[PDB]
Scaffold this motif. Structure first.
Motif, short mmCIF file in Angstrom:
data_model
loop_
_atom_site.label_atom_id
_atom_site.label_comp_id
_atom_site.label_asym_id
_atom_site.label_seq_id
_atom_site.Cartn_x
_atom_site.Cartn_y
_atom_site.Cartn_z
N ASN C 978 0.61 -22.94 -0.28
CA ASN C 978 1.17 -21.60 -0.15
C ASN C 978 0.82 -20.98 1.20
N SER C 981 3.37 -20.85 4.48
CA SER C 981 4.30 -19.76 4.74
C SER C 981 3.72 -18.73 5.71
N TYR C 993 20.96 -14.43 5.04
CA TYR C 993 21.31 -13.68 3.84
C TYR C 993 22.02 -12.38 4.19
N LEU C 996 25.68 -13.12 4.80
CA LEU C 996 26.40 -13.25 3.54
C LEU C 996 26.73 -11.88 2.95
N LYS C 997 25.77 -10.96 2.98
CA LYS C 997 26.01 -9.64 2.40
C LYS C 997 27.00 -8.84 3.23
N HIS C 1062 17.98 0.76 7.70
CA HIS C 1062 16.87 0.78 6.76
C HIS C 1062 16.83 -0.48 5.91
N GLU C 1063 17.99 -1.08 5.63
CA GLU C 1063 18.00 -2.33 4.88
C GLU C 1063 17.51 -3.48 5.75
N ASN C 1069 9.81 -6.06 6.75
CA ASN C 1069 8.61 -5.33 6.33
C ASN C 1069 7.84 -5.01 7.61
N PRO D 18 13.72 5.51 2.48
CA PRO D 18 12.27 5.54 2.66
C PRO D 18 11.91 5.75 4.12
N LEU D 51 26.14 -0.49 -3.89
CA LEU D 51 24.76 -0.50 -4.34
C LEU D 51 23.82 -0.68 -3.16
N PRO D 52 22.59 -0.16 -3.25
CA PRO D 52 21.59 -0.50 -2.24
C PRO D 52 21.26 -1.99 -2.30
N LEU D 53 20.50 -2.43 -1.30
CA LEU D 53 20.16 -3.84 -1.19
C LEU D 53 19.32 -4.31 -2.37
N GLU D 85 25.24 -9.97 -4.89
CA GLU D 85 25.13 -9.36 -3.57
C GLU D 85 25.58 -10.32 -2.47
N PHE D 86 25.20 -11.59 -2.58
CA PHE D 86 25.46 -12.57 -1.54
C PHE D 86 26.57 -13.54 -1.90
N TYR D 145 13.13 0.51 -2.82
CA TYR D 145 13.38 -0.78 -2.15
C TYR D 145 12.33 -1.86 -2.37
N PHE D 150 11.87 -8.06 -5.64
CA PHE D 150 12.09 -8.02 -4.20
C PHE D 150 11.06 -8.86 -3.46
N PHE D 153 11.79 -12.62 -3.61
CA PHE D 153 12.90 -13.00 -2.75
C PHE D 153 12.46 -13.06 -1.29
N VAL D 154 11.62 -12.12 -0.86
CA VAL D 154 11.21 -12.06 0.54
C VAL D 154 10.41 -13.31 0.92
N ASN D 155 9.63 -13.84 -0.02
CA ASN D 155 8.78 -15.01 0.23
C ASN D 155 9.64 -16.27 0.14
N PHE D 156 10.27 -16.61 1.26
CA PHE D 156 11.22 -17.72 1.27
C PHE D 156 10.50 -19.06 1.18
N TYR D 157 9.43 -19.24 1.95
CA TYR D 157 8.78 -20.55 2.07
C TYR D 157 7.62 -20.66 1.08
N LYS D 158 7.95 -20.49 -0.19
CA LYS D 158 6.98 -20.64 -1.26
C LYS D 158 7.27 -21.93 -2.01
#
Ligand SMILES: Nc1ncnc2c1ncn2[C@@H]1O[C@H](COP(=O)(O)OP(=O)(O)OP(=O)(O)O)[C@@H](O)[C@H]1O
Ligand SMILES: [Mg+2]
Lengths: 279, 113, 1077, 240
Positions: C978, C981, C993, C996-997, C1062-1063, C1069, D18, D51-53, D85-86, D145, D150, D153-158
Motif C-alpha cells: 500500500n 501509492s 476521469y 470522461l465526465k 472547485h471540482e 486535495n 467549500p 449533480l455535483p461530482l 458520472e463517467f 465533497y 470519495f 475512489f481518490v486512492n487509485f493505486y491501491k
C-alpha cells in the motif's frame, strides 16, 4: 518566449450558402439535425439528389447515437427525399431500413403522413392495412387514424368495417377507447348520427362509466343541437352519479345554457338543480 | 518467420486406441489422415509466421506446439506421440550483428607494456 | 509508367520559361552586341602602362593571385575586337524558369594574335585575359551612359562558376530594354581561341606553373576556356539526333538543384562541380557508347524518362573516381576504362579536357549516393516517387541533410595566423591555387583519416564565401577575411555510420617486428593518443581509445583532437546543438550513467534478463492448464520507454511492463464475458499462491484494469522482481475475441459502433500489441538511432501536453517514418537529425488528404505488395468518404500489422490533432527564421500554456525525480505494498476521469512524466483545460446539455467555470495549489 | 439570484461550495423535478440534473437530512438510481454475450424515497429552499465533497485485497456453474411441444438461448437444358 500556436477547432491550420459553410457549421455542431437537413435541402435544391443521399448517410453515423430525436429527423428527411425524388424500390429500402434503427411503429406513422401530404391516397390505404396487421393488436391509434383517413374520403361503410376489425384484433380493455374515439371522429368529420349511435351502445354496455356520459354530452354541446343536449342532460342526472359529479353536470348544463343565452333555460336548470340539491 | 528465416517443419503423429477399445489395431481412414494433416499444417504455418526465430525456439523447448496439435485433432481422431520431428533452415536474412548481440544479452584492450 | 509520363509533362510545362521574356532579353543583348563592336581597339602596353591607364579610372583590373609584379610581367598587353557569341543553356534553348533568376552566358573569344604559344605558363594567359576584361568593362561602361542604359543596369565582377582564376562581368537589371521582369543576368565570359595552346601540355598530369607537381586546377581553367563553342556544337549535334534531349536535360537540372548540386567549384568547399552542363555532357557521351565494350547505353529513340534513368543508373553503378573512368570524343565510341585516377574523371580525348575537374572526391561520393538512392526510387513500383525525385528540396537545412555539423573558428579572424598561413607555402600554391582550396583539402584529409569508418561522407563548407565584387576592386573582400581569406569560418558536415560510429577503440595497423608504413602514419597522426594494445583474441595492434559520454558522441572528440593537432592548435571546434538534444534525453540513475553512450541498450537488456528468470519460474509451475506462451509487450521490450528502466524506480509510469500470458486451448472456459474474466483471475490467484510459496523473494499484488470499456472484471497480476523490476500479467484466451464479436452482433444497431470501439481497444492491447512489439524490436537493431529519437519525441510530446491523448504506439509509428521511408533524405544518423526529420514530416503531413502507411522492414520478405498497397489505399478513401473533414479520425497510420489504419489513432480530439500539426509547423518555421542554436532548441521544449483557457498548478508532496530513476532514491520495495501509492503521481488518472465526465464541454491535458518535466524536484505538474466553442456561449436549458451550468434566465444557462474549478481542485486535495483563468 | 424555478418545472437548488486554499461565495446549481413513471422501481423518485461530482447516496442523505432539520420534515432517501458520472455502465456487456447471470441520460440521476409521504414532503422543503438564494444567500447549505466512498475512489493505486478477491471469484464461479448445469439439462431433456413436436438439439449444445440465436443468425444445378422436346425445338429455333 515559448512555442505557442492558436488552437484550431476546424483544421484550418491544415446564413450558410455553400458546401464549405455547411461543412464548417458541422465541425462544431455535428449533433444538430437542423444543420444536416438544411445541408441536404441545399443539395436537393441544386438537383444533386445523389449527393443529398450520401449526406443523409453521414448524418446517420456522425450524429451521436444517444440523440434519438435528431436521428428521427434524418430518417423522416430521407423518407421525404425518396418519396419526392426517388422511386418505389428505394423508398421501400429506406422505409425498411428506418424501422430497423428506430421504433418501427413510429416510422410507419410518419410515412403514412408523408403519403397523405403528398396526396398519394392509394399507397396510404395500402399502408394503413399493412401497419394494422402488424400493430393493430396493440396500438389503438392506427384504427382511429385509419378510420380518420376513410371518413376524410367520404368512406363511411368501410370505416364501420375497420372498427369491427379493430374490436376483433384489439384486447377487450381497449374496445371502449377505440369506439369512443371513432365516435368522436364521426362528430368532427363524419356523420354525427353515426357518432351518437356508437356512444349509445357504449353507454348501454357500461352504464356506470360516468366519464363516457361526460364525453358524449361534450360532443353534443360541440354540435350545438340544443334539444339533444337538453335531453341528454336530463338522462345523465337520472343515473348512478355521485353528489360531486352531479354538481359538475348541473354546472356544465348551466354553463352551456348561458352560452346559449336564454335566461329562462338557466332558470329552469337552477330549479332542476335545486330540487336535486334537496334530494 | 517474421525475421525472414525460411524454414521447413516436420511433424509426426500416431493413432492410438481408446481406453475401452477391443480391436487390435487403431487404423484411421485416409479421410481422417487428410483431415489431420490439414489441421497440423494450419497450426505449424500459424505458429511460425506469427513469431520470430528466437520466439519459435522458445516454443520448441516446452513442446507447446505439440499440445496445440493434440487439442485441435482431438475431435477428429485420438493421437499419440505427436512431435515436431525436424526443423530445417532453408534460407537466412542478411546477418545483423546487433540482433545477434541482443539475443546473447565493446572491450578495450590492455596496454602492452 | 503511364502515370509517370503525364507527371513529367505537368512538371515540364510548370517550369517552362515564358516565351515573352525570351524575346525581352533577346531584344536587349542583340542591342548589347552592337555596343561591343563600338568599343575601340588598343595598342600594346606593359604592366606599368596599363597600371597608369587604370590608375585614375574607377575600374580596376581584376588580377588573379599572384598579381603580376613588374619583374615577371615582361610580356605586353593588348585589346582587340572579340568574336561575340552565345553559349550555355540559352544557346541550347534548354533553360527553365527559376524564381531566383538565370544567367545568359555570352562568350567573347580573344583574337588569337594576342597570345604566344607559351602563354599557358605562369598565369600569362590569365593576366592578359584580365586586362582584356577590364578594358572592355571600361569602354562598355561609358557607352551605357551614352545610351542612357546606366539608369537601370548594375555591373559587377564575378568568378565564373566560383573559379578564382576566371573573373567575368555580370550585367544585372534593377527595377524599354529593362529586362528586370525576365529575371536574367548576362555573363561576359572572355575565352581563348580553340587550340591556341597545345592541349597535351595542359593534361591533368602536366604542369604549367613553375616552382615538378601537376596543376590540374590551373590546367583546367586555361584549357576549358579555350573549349566553349566546341562543346556547344557537340550538344547541338546530339540535340538533333535524340528528340528528348532537352526534356531529359531539365529533369536532370531539376534533380540536381533539389540536392543542392551546382556547376561551381567544389574545391573551395561548396557542394558542386556537377551541374546541367556536366549532366548533359555525360548524357551525350553515353549516347555514343559508355559500356566497357563501348556499346551504347542510351539510344536516340529513348524518351525523356528513359534518358534520365539511364544517366542516373550510370552514376549509381559505374565508378568514375577510384577504380574506373569514362573517356569520350566530342569530335570514337565512348568507352569505360577500368583504370582510375583517384579523382572524378570524364575525359575528352578530342579536347584533352576532364569535365569533372571541378568535382571533388567528397562530393562525387555524395552524388554517387544520391544517384543510387533515386535509382531505387526509380525502380520502385508499389509507391509513387515523382514528388521525392523532383519536387522535394533537401538542401534547405544542412542539419536535416547532414547528421553532424561542426563549426571550426580558425584563429586570428586581419589575416590568418603566421603558422596557419605559413603552412600554405609555395609548393601547395602550385597545386591548390587559393588558400581556401588548400584548407578545404587539408580539413577534409585530416577529418577523413581521423574518423575513417565512423563516417560515410564528409563535406567541408567555407561559410560566408562571396563570389561577386565591385568593378572598383580587384578581388573579393570579406568582412572577416579582409582580402586575405574569403570566408567567415569552416563547417565540417558529416554523414555518420551508426553501426560503428560510437566504437570505444579506433583500431589501427597490426604490430610487426619492423614498423610498416601504415603503422608509421598511424602513430605520427595520433601522437600521444596512440598506443599499442592487446586484446582477448591475442592480437597486437596500434590503436587509440576514447571515452563515451551521454552528452556528446565520440566523433566530437576525435575531430576536435585531430583538427587542433594537424590544422592549428588555436582552432575552436564546437557543436553545441547536438549536446542539448543529448541532454534532453533523461539521464538514468544507474552506475556510470554519465559515461554511457545514447546507443547503449544495457539497461533494457538487464530488465529482459530479470524477465527470463521470472519466465522460467512460471513455465515449471503446475496449473490446471499448461502455459502456451508468455509474451512481453511493454515499452521496455521494444526499447521505446522514455526513461530507461532502473531497478526499484517505481514512480516511473512505465515501471510495470505488460505481459500476455496464454494457456493451452480448452473447451471449459466460461461462455460469458464476466465469468470468463473471473475464470482468468482464478489462474492468476494460483500463480500468485504458488509463486508466493516456492519463490518467496518475489513479491506480487493485484490491480484492476479499466482500459477496455464496459469490461469491468479484468484483474492483472503485478510481479515485483528481486532485481527491482515490475511486470504486469494479463491472461489472453481464444474465447476472448469471439465473445466481443458476439456482443457486437447482439447489440442494438444504434449501439454497435460503441461496442466496436470496445473491440478496437481490446485488439490494440491483446492482439495487435504482440505483433507491434515483435516487429518494432527486430527492426530497431538495424536503426540504431530509432530508440533515442522516439524517446526524445515522446519527451517532446509530453512537454506540450500531447501524450495524454496520443497513444505511445502512434508516437512510435510516426517516429519510425524517417527510418523506414527516408526518401529523399538518408536514414537518420544523429539524435538531432532524426528528431528534426520527425518534426519536418509532421509539419508537411496533410493527414486529411494523405494516409501514412509504413513498410516496417529492415533496409534492403514482408514488403507491402501492390495488391496490399491498393487495399490500404482503398481503406483510406472509404474512410474519408464518410469523414471527409477528419473530425472522427485524423491520422491514418497503417501497416502490415494494422491494415485498417484506425487501430492506434482513434479517439484523439480534433484540437489535439491540429495542435500536433500546428506545433510542428511552428517549430519548422522557427528553424527557418532562426537557425538551430542554443536558444531555439529551448523554445522547442518549453510549452505555450497561454493558448489554453485555464491552467491549474499541482505539486506532489514529495519530489518524484529520484524515485522515477532520473539522475539530477529507493533501493528496495516497501514492506507494505500500500506504500507504493504514496510515491506515485495520480494527476494522469485525474485528467482521464475528468475527461470522461466533461467530455461534452472540456478537454483537459497534463504531463504524464512528472519526474522528467516537473522541474528540479519533479513535483510540479499542470492541468490545462479547453472549453469547447459551443458551451463558451450561453445555451437554452434542456435535459441533455450534459454540462455543469448556472442559470442566467429562465431558459438560459452558461458554463459554471467556478464550480468546475472547485471540482478539479477537490480531486487533487493537497496537490492543487493555484488556478489561472 | 432571483431565479427560483425554470419555467419547464426544474427547481434550482443552489449549494455553497467549500473553501479550498487554491480557490480563495461561489455556488453549484442543481436542477430538480418530480419524476413520474408507472415502473415500480422508478416510482417515488425525484429527477436530478447537474449533480455535483461523485454524488453517492450518502451525499444525498446528508443533504436531505439538513433539509429535514431546517424545516422539521420527515424524509428518507432510499437509493440514487442511474448515477453514471463517467459513463462506465452505459451498456451491460454481460447481457449481450450470454443470458446466464444477467437477465437484462448523462449528468442526471433518480433519487428514490421510501414512500410518497417522504418525496412530496421533500419537494416543499426544496421549493422553500430554492427561494433562499433571492433573500438570504448566506444560509444556503454546503455540499461536503468528502465521504468514505470519495476517499476510496481518490486512492487509485491501491492493491486489491486478495482475501476479498478469492471469495468474490469463489461465489461467482459457484453460481455460474449451477446456471450452466441447469441450462444444459434444459436443452437435452426431450423438449416436446403441446402438439407433440419434439425439438432437435445437437450434442454439446448448452443453452436454448443459443439455439434461438443460431436460428436468427441463419434445382437450378440439377436442371437439364436439353432433355424435353420443347427444349430441343427451342434450341432448333435459335440455331437458325
Ligand atoms: N565542367 C566543365 N568543363 C568544361 N567546360 C565547362 C564546364 N562547366 C561549364 N563549362 C563551360 O561553361 C559554359 C557555361 O557554363 P554553365 O554552367 O553556366 O552552363 P549551363 O549548364 O548551360 O548553364 P545553367 O546551369 O545556368 O543553365 C559551358 O558552355 C561550357 O563552355
Ligand atoms: Mg551560365
Amino acid at each position: 518566449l515559448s512555442l505557442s500556436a492558436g488552437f484550431d477547432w476546424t483544421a484550418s491550420i491544415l446564413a450558410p450558402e455553400s458546401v464549405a459553410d455547411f461543412e464548417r457549421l458541422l465541425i462544431g455542431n455535428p449533433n444538430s439535425s437542423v444543420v444536416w437537413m438544411n445541408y441536404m435541402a441545399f443539395q436537393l435544391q441544386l438537383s444533386e439528389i445523389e449527393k443529398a443521399r450520401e449526406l443523409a448517410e453521414r448524418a446517420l453515423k456522425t450524429i451521436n447515437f444517444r440523440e434519438e430525436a435528431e436521428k428521427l429527423n434524418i430518417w423522416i428527411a430521407m423518407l421525404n427525399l425518396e418519396n419526392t425524388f426517388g422511386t418505389e424500390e428505394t423508398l421501400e429500402e429506406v422505409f425498411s431500413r428506418a424501422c430497423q434503427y428506430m421504433d418501427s411503429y413510429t416510422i410507419h406513422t410518419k410515412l403514412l403522413g408523408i403519403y397523405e401530404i403528398s396526396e398519394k391516397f392509394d399507397k396510404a390505404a395500402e399502408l394503413f392495412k399493412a401497419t394494422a396487421k402488424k400493430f393493430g393488436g396493440e396500438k389503438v391509434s392506427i384504427w382511429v387514424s385509419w378510420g380518420d383517413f376513410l371518413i376524410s374520403h367520404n368512406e363511411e361503410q368501410e370505416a364501420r368495417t375497420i372498427l369491427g376489425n379493430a374490436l376483433k384484433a384489439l384486447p377487450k380493455r381497449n374496445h371502449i377507447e377505440v369506439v369512443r374515439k371513432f365516435a368522436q371522429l364521426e362528430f368532427a368529420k363524419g356523420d354525427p348520427e353515426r357518432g351518437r349511435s356508437l356512444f349509445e351502445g357504449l353507454v348501454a354496455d357500461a352504464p356506470k362509466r360516468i366519464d363516457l356520459w361526460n364525453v358524449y354530452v361534450d360532443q353534443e354541446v360541440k354540435a350545438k343541437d340544443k334539444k339533444k343536449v337538453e335531453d341528454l342532460f336530463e338522462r345523465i342526472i337520472t343515473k348512478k352519479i355521485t353528489r360531486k359529479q352531479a354538481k359538475f353536470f348541473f354546472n356544465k348544463w348551466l354553463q352551456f345554457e348561458e352560452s346559449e343565452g336564454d335566461e329562462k333555460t338557466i332558470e329552469y336548470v337552477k330549479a332542476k338543480a335545486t330540487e336535486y340539491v334537496a334530494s | 518467420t517474421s525475421d525472414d528465416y525460411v524454414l521447413r517443419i516436420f511433424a509426426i503423429a500416431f493413432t492410438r486406441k481408446q481406453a475401452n477399445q477391443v480391436k487390435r489395431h487403431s487404423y484411421a481412414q485416409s479421410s481422417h489422415i487428410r483431415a489431420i494433416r490439414k489441421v497440423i499444417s494450419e497450426i505449424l504455418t500459424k505458429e511460425v509466421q506469427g513469431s520470430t526465430l528466437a520466439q519459435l525456439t522458445s516454443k520448441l523447448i516446452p513442446e507447446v506446439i505439440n499440445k496445440e496439435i493434440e487439442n485441435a485433432t482431438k475431435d477428429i481422431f485420438p493421437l499419440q506421440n505427436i512431435h515436431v520431428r525436424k526443423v530445417k533452415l532453408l534460407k537466412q536474412p542478411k546477418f545483423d550483428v546487433g540482433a545477434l548481440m541482443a539475443l546473447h544479452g565493446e572491450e578495450k584492450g590492455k596496454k602492452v607494456t | 509508367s503511364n502515370i509517370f509520363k503525364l507527371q513529367i509533362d505537368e512538371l515540364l510545362e510548370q517550369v517552362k520559361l515564358k516565351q515573352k521574356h525570351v524575346l525581352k532579353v533577346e531584344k536587349f543583348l542583340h542591342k548589347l552586341y552592337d555596343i561591343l563592336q563600338e568599343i575601340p581597339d588598343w595598342e600594346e602596353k606593359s604592366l606599368a602602362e596599363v597600371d597608369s591607364f587604370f590608375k585614375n579610372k574607377i575600374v580596376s583590373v581584376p588580377f588573379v593571385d599572384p598579381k603580376p609584379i613588374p619583374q615577371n610581367t615582361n610580356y605586353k598587353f593588348n585589346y582587340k575586337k572579340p568574336d561575340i557569341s552565345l553559349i550555355g543553356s540559352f544557346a541550347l534553348k534548354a533553360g527553365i524558369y527559376q524564381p531566383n533568376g538565370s544567367s545568359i552566358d555570352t562568350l567573347l573569344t580573344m583574337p588569337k594574335e594576342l597570345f604566344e604559344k607559351k602563354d599557358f605558363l605562369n598565369f600569362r594567359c590569365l593576366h592578359k585575359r584580365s586586362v582584356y576584361l577590364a578594358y572592355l568593362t571600361h569602354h562598355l561602361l561609358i557607352l551605357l551612359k551614352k545610351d542612357k542604359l546606366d539608369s537601370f543596369l548594375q555591373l559587377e565582377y564575378s568568378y565564373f562558376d566560383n573559379d578564382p582564376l576566371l573573373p567575368i562581368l555580370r550585367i544585372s537589371c534593377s527595377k524599354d530594354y529593362n529586362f528586370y521582369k525576365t529575371r536574367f543576368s548576362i555573363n561576359l565570359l572572355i575565352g581563348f581561341p580553340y587550340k591556341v595552346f597545345e592541349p597535351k601540355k595542359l593534361l591533368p598530369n602536366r604542369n604549367c606553373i613553375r616552382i615538378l607537381p601537376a596543376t590540374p586546377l590551373y590546367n583546367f581553367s586555361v584549357l576549358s576556356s579555350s573549349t566553349h563553342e566546341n562543346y556547344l556544337k557537340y550538344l547541338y549535334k546530339t540535340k538533333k539526333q535524340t528528340e528528348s534531349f532537352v526534356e531529359a536535360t531539365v529533369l536532370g537540372r531539376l534533380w540536381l538543384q533539389q540536392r543542392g548540386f551546382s556547376s561551381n567549384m567544389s574545391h573551395s568547399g561548396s557542394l558542386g562541380g556537377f551541374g546541367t552542363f556536366e549532366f548533359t555532357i555525360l548524357m551525350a557521351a553515353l549516347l555514343n557508347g559508355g559500356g566497357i565494350n563501348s556499346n551504347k547505353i542510351l539510344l536516340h529513340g529513348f524518351s525523356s524518362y528513359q534518358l534520365f534513368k539511364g544517366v542516373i543508373k550510370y552514376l549509381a553503378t559505374m565508378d568514375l573516381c577510384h577504380d574506373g573512368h569514362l573517356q569520350f570524343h566530342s569530335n570514337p565510341a565512348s568507352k569505360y576504362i577500368d583504370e582510375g585516377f583517384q579523382t572524378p574523371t570524364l575525359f575528352d580525348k578530342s579536347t584533352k579536357v576532364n569535365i569533372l575537374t571541378k568535382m571533388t572526391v567528397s562530393s562525387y561520393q555524395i552524388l554517387k549516393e544520391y544517384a543510387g538512392e533515386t535509382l531505387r526510387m526509380l525502380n520502385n513500383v508499389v509507391q509513387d516517387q515523382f514528388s521525392n525525385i523532383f519536387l522535394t528540396n533537401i538542401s534547405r537545412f544542412d542539419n536535416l541533410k547532414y547528421d553532424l555539423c561542426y563549426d571550426v573558428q580558425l584563429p586570428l579572424g586581419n589575416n590568418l595566423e603566421t603558422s596557419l598561413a605559413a603552412t600554405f607555402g609555395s609548393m601547395e600554391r602550385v597545386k591548390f591555387i587559393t588558400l581556401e582550396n588548400f584548407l578545404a583539402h587539408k580539413i577534409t584529409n585530416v577529418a577523413r583519416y581521423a574518423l575513417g569508418d565512423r563516417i560515410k561522407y564528409i563535406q567541408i563548407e567555407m561559410v560566408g564565401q562571396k563570389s561577386d565584387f565591385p568593378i572598383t576592386k580587384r578581388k573579393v573582400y570579406s568582412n572577416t577575411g579582409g582580402n586575405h581569406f574569403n570566408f567567415d569560418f569552416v563547417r565540417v558536415k558529416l554523414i555518420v555510420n551508426p553501426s560503428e560510429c560510437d566504437k570505444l577503440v579506433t583500431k589501427g595497423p597490426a604490430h610487426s617486428e619492423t614498423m610498416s608504413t601504415e603503422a608509421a602514419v598511424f602513430k605520427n597522426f595520433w601522437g600521444i593518443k596512440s598506443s599499442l594494445r592487446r586484446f582477448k583474441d591475442g592480437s597486437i595492434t596500434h590503436c587509440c581509445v576514447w571515452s563515451t559520454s551521454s552528452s556528446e558522441p565520440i566523433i566530437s572528440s576525435i575531430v576536435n583532437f585531430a583538427l587542433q593537432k594537424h590544422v592549428s592548435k588555436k582552432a575552436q571546434i564546437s557543436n553545441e546543438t547536438i549536446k542539448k538534444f543529448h541532454n534532453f534525453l533523461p539521464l538514468p540513475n544507474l552506475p556510470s550513467s554519465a559515461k554511457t553512450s545514447v546507443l547503449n541498450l544495457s539497461s533494457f537488456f538487464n530488465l529482459k534478463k530479470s524477465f527470463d528468470d521470472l519466465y522460467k519460474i512460471i513455465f515449471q509451475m503446475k496449473l490446471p492448464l499448461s502455459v502456451k506462451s508468455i509474451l512481453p509487450v511493454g515499452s521496455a521490450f521494444r526499447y521505446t520507454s522514455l526513461c530507461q528502466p532502473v531497478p526499484f524506480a517505481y514512480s516511473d509510469p512505465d515501471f510495470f511492463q505488460d505481459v500476455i500470458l496464454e494457456f493451452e486451448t480448452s473447451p471449459k472456459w466460461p461462455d460469458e464475458i464476466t465469468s470468463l474474466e473471473k475464470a482468468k483471475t482464478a489462474f492468476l490467484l494460483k500463480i500468485q499462491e504458488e509463486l508466493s510459496a516456492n519463490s518467496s523473494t518475489y513479491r506480487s499484488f493485484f490491480s484492476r484494469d479499466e482500459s477496455i470499456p464496459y469490461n469491468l472484471e479484468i484483474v492483472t497480476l503485478n510481479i515485483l522482481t528481486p532485481e527491482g523490476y515490475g511486470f504486469k500479467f494479463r491472461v489472453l484466451t481464444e474465447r476472448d475475441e469471439i465473445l466481443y464479436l458476439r456482443a457486437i452482433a447482439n447489440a442494438r444497431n444504434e449501439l454497435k459502433p460503441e461496442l466496436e470501439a470496445t473491440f478496437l481497444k481490446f485488439t490494440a492491447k491483446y492482439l495487435a500489441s504482440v505483433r507491434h512489439t515483435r516487429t518494432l524490436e527486430n527492426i530497431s537493431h538495424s536503426y540504431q538511432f530509432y530508440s533515442p529519437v522516439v524517446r526524445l519525441f515522446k519527451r517532446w510530446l509530453d512537454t506540450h501536453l500531447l501524450l495524454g491523448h496520443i497513444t505511445d504506439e502512434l508516437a512510435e509509428l510516426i517516429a519510425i517514418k524517417p527510418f523506414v521511408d527516408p526518401a529523399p533524405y538518408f536514414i537518420p544518423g544523429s539524435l538531432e537529425n532524426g528528431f528534426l526529420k520527425v518534426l519536418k514530416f509532421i509539419s508537411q503531413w496533410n493527414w486529411k488528404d494523405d494516409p501514412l502507411i509504413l513498410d516496417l522492414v529492415k533496409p534492403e520478405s514482408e514488403r507491402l505488395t501492390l495488391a496490399q498497397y491498393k487495399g490500404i489505399q482503398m481503406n483510406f478513401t472509404n474512410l474519408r468518404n464518410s469523414d471527409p473533414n477528419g473530425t472522427h479520425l485524423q491520422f491514418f497510420v497503417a501497416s502490415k500489422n494494422d491494415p485498417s489504419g484506425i487501430l492506434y489513432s482513434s479517439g484523439i480530439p480534433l484540437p489535439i490533432a491540429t495542435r500536433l500539426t500546428a506545433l510542428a509547423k511552428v517549430a519548422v518555421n522557427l528553424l527557418q527564421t532562426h537557425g538551430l542554436n542554443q536558444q531555439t532548441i529551448n523554445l522547442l521544449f518549453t510549452p505555450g500554456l497561454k493558448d489554453y483557457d485555464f491552467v491549474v498548478d499541482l505539486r506532489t508532496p514529495i519530489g518524484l525525480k529520484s524515485s522515477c530513476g532520473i539522475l539530477s532514491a529507493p533501493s528496495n520495495f516497501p514492506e507494505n505494498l500500500n506504500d507504493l501509492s504514496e510515491k506515485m503521481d495520480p494527476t494522469y488518472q485525474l485528467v482521464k476521469y475528468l475527461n470522461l465526465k466533461y467530455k461534452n464541454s472540456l478537454i483537459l491535458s497534463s504531463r504524464k512524466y512528472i519526474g522528467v518535466n516537473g522541474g528540479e524536484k519533479g513535483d510540479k505538474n499542470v492541468i490545462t483545460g479547453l472549453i469547447k466553442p459551443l458551451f463558451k456561449g450561453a445555451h437554452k436549458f434542456r435535459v441533455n446539455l450534459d454540462c455543469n451550468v448556472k442559470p442566467v434566465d429562465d431558459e438560459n444557462v452558461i458554463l459554471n467555470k467556478e464550480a468546475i474549478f472547485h471540482e478539479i481542485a477537490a480531486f487533487g486535495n493537497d496537490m492543487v495549489i493555484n488556478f489561472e483563468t | 439570484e432571483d431565479i427560483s424555478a425554470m419555467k419547464n418545472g426544474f427547481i434550482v437548488v443552489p449549494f455553497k461550495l467549500p473553501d479550498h486554499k487554491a480557490l480563495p461565495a461561489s455556488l453549484h446549481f442543481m436542477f430538480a423535478k418530480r419524476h413520474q413513471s408507472s415502473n415500480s422501481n422508478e416510482s417515488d423518485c425525484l429527477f436530478l440534473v447537474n449533480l455535483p461530482l461523485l454524488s453517492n447516496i450518502e451525499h444525498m442523505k446528508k443533504f436531505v437530512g439538513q433539509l429535514c432539520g431546517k424545516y422539521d420534515t420527515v424524509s428518507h432517501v432510499e437509493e440514487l438510481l442511474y448515477n453514471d458520472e463517467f459513463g462506465l455502465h452505459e451498456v451491460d456487456l454481460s447481457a449481450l454475450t450470454s443470458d446466464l447471470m444477467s437477465s437484462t441520460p448523462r449528468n442526471t440521476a433518480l433519487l428514490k424515497f421510501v414512500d410518497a409521504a417522504s418525496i412530496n414532503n421533500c419537494w416543499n422543503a426544496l421549493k422553500k429552499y430554492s427561494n433562499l438564494h433571492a433573500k438570504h444567500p448566506n444560509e444556503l447549505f454546503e455540499w461536503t465533497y468528502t465521504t468514505p466512498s470519495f476517499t476510496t475512489f481518490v486512492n487509485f493505486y491501491k492493491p486489491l485485497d486478495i482475501d476479498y478477491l478469492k471469495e468474490d471469484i469463489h461465489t461467482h464461479m459457484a453460481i455460474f456453474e449451477q446456471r450452466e448445469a441447469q441450462a444444459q439439462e434444459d436443452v437435452q431433456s426431450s423438449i416436446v411441444d403441446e402438439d407433440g413436436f419434439t425439438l432437435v438439439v445437437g450434442k454439446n449444445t448448452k443453452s436454448l438461448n443459443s439455439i434461438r440465436k443460431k436460428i436468427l443468425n441463419k434445382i437450378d444445378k440439377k436442371a437439364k437444358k436439353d432433355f424435353y422436346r420443347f427444349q430441343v425445338r427451342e434450341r432448333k429455333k435459335q440455331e437458325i
